[PDB]
Specification:
2 copies of one chain form a homodimer. The first copy, chain A, has 21 helices and 9 strands. Chain A starts with a helix and ends with a helix. The first copy, chain A, has 3 domains: 185 residues, Regulator of G-protein Signalling 4, domain 2; 91 residues, Phosphorylase Kinase, domain 1; 200 residues, Orthogonal Bundle (Transferase(Phosphotransferase), domain 1), CATH 1.10.510.10. Helices cover 39% and strands 8% of the residues of chain A. At the A-B interface, helix 3 and helix 9 of A face helix 3 and helix 9 of B. Chain B: Keywords: ATP-binding, Cell projection, Kinase, Lipoprotein, Membrane, Methylation, Nucleotide-binding, Phosphoprotein, Prenylation, Sensory transduction, Serine/threonine-protein kinase, Transferase, Vision. Chain B: It is found in: Membrane; Cell projection, Cilium, Photoreceptor outer segment. Chain B: GO terms for molecular function: ATP binding; rhodopsin kinase activity.
Chain lengths: 478, 466
């Protein structure tokens, strides 16, 4: 359904206002169209009416089409893409690059083919969009993004749960009609514990990331009683909810069910650590499942940030079992205390118990079993799972496949992912292995609540406009 | 059919170029959207996405719809327009309630919205997209469209605009012969007023350029032939025309001369062979060497030239004459339309110009049986022996003419629009000269050009969003 009165406060503006934007923004090619879908599309749309860059556009289109393609049609989509653009006078044979990257792709894998067009497409042809209409309309789409979207603009009625900080909800964006889990906090209780620093650190990195295994924050505002942060909804429940209490006499999960979730996690942590950031506490109950069936990772008090120029960070906190060996003694540890935690999680996924313990001891024996004891496996495991879990559960962090080379490119090779080609999961087209059932104050604080509230977080907002049709139905020409 | 290579030299530009345009142009409201259809439409299009000025837009739309409406549905379209806007559901809220009383003929109703629509709401278009695209449509208009851009094959020629595929009569002149007669002044005066007028009873000039051998001027298409072609040589044993056939053409002429003379300008030479017929069946007037201009502050102009018979009485002696030497010429034409001969003479009788002048001045018109009385009572007006008793240009328009009995059937609206089924559908050089040829060639004449883009779809298919 759709609302009108809140959709009415949203109009397409004039041009004497988009001049304060012109100077203060400095989006280099990369930060704009390639990442911002309203940019993407508007610039797509610039290459659509301008006839000279059809071949380069469709080129890139069909690269995104092959990127996500299935696994018995990749040979065919390859022979489709090779016959259209590459070789003896193709009919959409473009003429702006020379002929050095034509040689590059002939072996397979067409990833370097893509970056060859990107580099150029962002230089000589890119000049025009800027000095053309489509871009300007973006400024005006952009203009309305830089606006104050307060408590008025969202609704409350059904609540997720209660840990302590406040009350967690699902909320609909009124004008458009999009749903969002918006976490709400009793302000007085927040200042009551100096819990400022764990939350903002948690906020600062939410808006900076868009990985569909990480709760993507859309908005940030101040009501009066509470502070809020819209993130991409998750219903049914968490993974413990499923592991232990979905099917009782058949405890735990099957093989492709746990695999599918483990992979979605691998890429969430990749994004986590690509920006130099730790999760520390990683477990099933700290992982959710949406109505669509694509999981994420949740609850981010334990979300410490690593700075720039420094190497490591120290401490003592987390969850007994999902701490690493080098985390319990209290030494300098890399991100793989998460990957160690994941190993324990993956076990408790397909075990119905903590890996060292028995199902359902003090923290000293749990620490002594975290460090020393190896994993004694039963019959239920397939060999690919056993050969892989021995990597995560190593007693030191240099032999455990942690964050290496900048991405999990060494992890993604590992035997357990043969069926799963490492593309489709990052997009969102794979049928997940279980679909669910649906139906008085000082100055220092009020100056912070408005600092905290940066109104909008840009890109999920952009996505909301494009997916809901809001972009489509006010980007009108006739 | 359509061409590609010439349609390829026509692209939508960037924005760092439309800055020399910003300062040097000064289009006040009237000169832009209300008259320029690409402005009209783009601004229409601005009021289409902006939801607050739907009622004002459709208001004006339905005024243009009623303006042209037929004559047994005007009572109904009135009761349709009165029930929609005059608590109506598209009741607009920007004007007060003084013009609501006025209309209770809705012409003053229209100018009430126009006045306002061009003031408070008009500010935005300017500072909005739709206008900018106009700047870029405008930019490409200010371009050199030379000899390359047009074709010749059938002859004065007919020429097709290659890229789009639109037809045009483009009049071409041997330059050396032009300078050979100091015939500069009669042509430029003739050019200067062609581009300044768009009346569909006047050859509307679209372009102006220089080839090398010739200078040219594209004007709006007419096929079959001229009126003599029909009068004398359409149906041989039934010479001339019927009654509603000649009437229909005579009326179209009345309004062409109205436009001719509204701007203080004379045709002098008016005749059937100097009147054409298009494929659609709406006529115009043609060949404008004899197209002298009257200035400002002066009263009259003198001379000796034209065509023996279609000169006036006061034109042959060589005195000061008003426009009605045309209207006198028209009387002779209307006769030769429905007679198959010159009014005074006998058909094809080759008398000299002295007896033709003596019969132009003295002799009255001896009518036969074929005429209906409304035609006889009217032609006696045009063929009077002096210009003060002949119904010439009076009051600023032919409002005294339009009353006359011969036009009962014809209500004086539909012919000006273009919806009436016409009564016959068809089947070495110095510096002073090369500096003038490029002055002469102002490249484009804006509005018929604009029309070409909108009618051919050229506007429609490069004004694309998706």
């Amino acid at each position: 359904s759709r609302d009108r009165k809140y959709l009415a406060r949203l109009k397409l503006p004039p041009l004497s206002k988009c001049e304060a934007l012109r100077e203060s923004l400095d989006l280099g090619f990369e930060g704009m169209c390639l990442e911002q879908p309203i940019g993407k599309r508007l610039f797509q749309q610039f290459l659509r009416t301008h006839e000279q860059h059809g071949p380069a556009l469709q080129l890139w289109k069909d690269i995104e089409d092959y990127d996500t393609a299935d696994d018995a049609l990749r040979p065919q989509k390859a022979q489709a893409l090779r016959a259209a653009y590459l070789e003896p006078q193709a009919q959409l044979f473009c003429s702006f690059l020379d002929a050095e990257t034509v040689a590059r792709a002939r072996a397979g894998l067409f990833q370097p083919l893509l970056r060859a067009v990107l580099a150029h497409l962002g230089q000589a042809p890119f000049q025009e969009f800027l000095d053309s209409l489509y871009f300007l309309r973006f400024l005006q789409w952009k203009w309305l993004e830089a606006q104050p979207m307060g408590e008025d603009w969202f609704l409350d009625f059904r609540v997720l749960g209660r840990g302590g900080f406040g009350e967690v909800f699902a909320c609909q964006m009124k004008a458009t009609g999009k749903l969002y889990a918006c976490k709400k906090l009793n302000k007085k209780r927040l200042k009551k514990r100096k819990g400022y620093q764990g939350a903002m650190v948690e906020k600062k990195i939410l808006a900076k990331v868009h990985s569909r295994f990480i709760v993507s924050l859309a908005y940030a505002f101040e009501t009066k009683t509470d502070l809020c942060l819209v993130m991409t909804i998750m219903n049914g429940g968490d993974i413990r909810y499923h592991i232990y209490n979905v099917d009782e006499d058949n405890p735990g999960f099957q093989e492709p069910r746990a695999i599918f979730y483990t992979a979605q996690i691998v890429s969430g942590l990749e994004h986590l650590h690509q920006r130099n950031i730790i999760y520390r506490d990683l477990k099933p109950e700290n992982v959710l499942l949406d109505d669509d069936g694509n999981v994420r990772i949740s609850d981010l008090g334990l979300a410490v940030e690593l700075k720039a120029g420094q190497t490591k960070t120290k401490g003592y906190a987390g969850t007994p079992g999902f701490m690493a060996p080098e985390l319990l003694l209290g030494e300098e540890y890399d991100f793989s205390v998460d990957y160690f935690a994941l190993g324990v999680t993956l076990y408790e996924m397909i075990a119905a118990r903590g890996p060292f313990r028995a199902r359902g001891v003090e923290n000293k024996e749990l620490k002594q079993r975290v460090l020393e004891q190896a994993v004694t496996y039963p019959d239920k495991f397939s060999p690919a799972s056993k050969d892989f879990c021995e990597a995560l559960l190593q007693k030191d962090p240099e032999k455990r496949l942690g964050f290496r080379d900048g991405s999990c490119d060494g992890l993604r090779t590992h035997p357990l992912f043969r069926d799963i080609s490492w593309r489709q999961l990052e997009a969102g087209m794979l049928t997940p292995p279980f679909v669910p059932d649906s139906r008085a104050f000082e100055k220092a604080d009020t100056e912070f609540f408005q600092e905290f509230a940066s109104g909008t977080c840009p890109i999920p907002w952009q996505e909301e406009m494009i997916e809901t049709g809001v972009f489509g139905d006010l980007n009108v020409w006739r």
